[PDB]
Structure 1
C-alpha cells in the first residue's frame, strides 16, 4: 500500500476539491453491487453517519474469510491490503475502516487504521444472515478542504446505478438529518 500512500492523487483523484472523497464511496459501492448481484434478494444500504464516516452493506455471500495459502492471512485481509481502483486504495486512505463479514453461520470482524490491520480477522459470533459491511472514516491527513459527504452527489449516482443493475435494491440513508432514498429498478 505504500505506493498509494506516496501519491494518493494518482489512485483516488483530486484530494482537495471533494471528487476524490466521493470516489472513495463509489469504489466501495461498486464492490457491494458485485456482491449483491451474486445473490437473489440483492440489497445494498449506503449510510452517511453523523461522524462523517460512510458504511456500505450488502446481503450477498460475504467476502472469503479463509487463510490465503501464500499470503498467510485471511482472504479478506489480502483484498484490503494488496494493490476500478480496488478497495485497498480506500483502506489505505481511510484513518479507520471497519470490516464485518457474515458467512457460513459466523460473524467475522476486523479493524484497520490507515490501511494497517489492528488484529487478524476474528470470528466474534454467530448469524443466520450473510453479507459484507465496510464502514470507513476518510483520512483527514489526505482529504483536505472538502471533508464532508454531500448527499446529492451520492443520491444522483446511486439512482443512475440502479438502472444498470436490475433487481438490486439500493437504499441511501443520511443519519445527520434523517434523509432517506430507495432506488430499486426491476427491469428485464
Structure 2
C-alpha cells in the first residue's frame, strides 16, 4: 500500500475538490455490487456500506498466510485496498458460515487478524471507513447528492440490486431500485 499512500490522487482522484473523497464510497459500493446494499453517511463523517451477500471469504490465503479478507484489504476498479490505505480507520464485519468476523484497520494497517466474534444466521459484508483527513483536504464532508446521483445510475445498471442511501446528519434517505 505504500505506493498508494505516496500518491493518493493517482489512485482515488483529486484529494482537494471532493472528487477522490466520494470515489472512496463508489469503490466500496462497486465491490459490494458483485441483493440489498445500504450506504449510510454517519454523523462522525464516516460512511458504511452493508450488504446481505454471501460475505467475503475469511479462510487463510495459502500464499499470503493471512485471511483472504485481509489480502483483499491490503494487496493491490482501483480496489478497496486503496480505500483502506487512505482511511484513518476502517472497520470490516463479515457474516459467513454461521459466524460474525471482525477486523479493524488504521491507515491500511490491520490492528489484529480477522477474528470470530460471535454467531449469526445472516450473511453479508459491512465496511465502515473514516477517510484520512491527512489526505483529503478542503472538501472533507460527504455531500448526499453526489452519492445519490451515482447510486441512482448504478441501480439502473444492476437491475436485481436494491440500494438504500441514508444520511444520519439530517435524516434524508432514498431507495434506488429498478
TM-score range, shorter chain: over 0.9
- State the alpha-carbon separation in 2 of the partners of residues 52 and 181 from structure 1: 18
Instruction: Give the drift of 1:167.
Output: 1.6
* Stretches of structure 1 lacking an aligned partner (at least 5 in a row): 35-41
- State the alpha-carbon separation in 1 of the partners of residues 44 and 91 from structure 2: 14
**What secondary structure does 1:72 align onto?**
coil
**Structure 2 counterpart of 1:88, from 81, 92, 96:** 81
- State the alpha-carbon separation in 2 of the partners of residues 161 and 7 from structure 1: 28
- State the alpha-carbon separation in 1 of the partners of residues 100 and 75 from structure 2: 23
Tell me the C-alpha RMSD between the 2 structures. Answer: 0.4
Deviating runs (4+, > 4 A) in structure 1?
none
Instruction: Give the drift of 1:143.
Output: 0.3
Instruction: Give the drift of 1:100.
Output: 0.1
**What secondary structure does 2:59 align onto?**
coil
* Stretches of structure 2 lacking an aligned partner (at least 5 in a row): none
Q: Counterpart in 1 of 2:137?
A: 144
**What secondary structure does 2:63 align onto?**
coil
Alignment size in residue pairs:
178
Q: TM-score, normalised by structure 1?
A: 0.94
- State the alpha-carbon separation in 1 of the partners of residues 49 and 36 from structure 2: 11
- State the alpha-carbon separation in 1 of the partners of residues 7 and 149 from structure 2: 29
Instruction: Give the drift of 1:30.
Output: 0.3
**What secondary structure does 1:16 align onto?**
coil
- State the alpha-carbon separation in 2 of the partners of residues 14 and 155 from structure 1: 20
Instruction: Give the drift of 1:127.
Output: 0.4
Q: Counterpart in 2 of 1:39?
A: none
Q: TM-score, normalised by structure 2?
A: 0.99
**What secondary structure does 1:14 align onto?**
coil
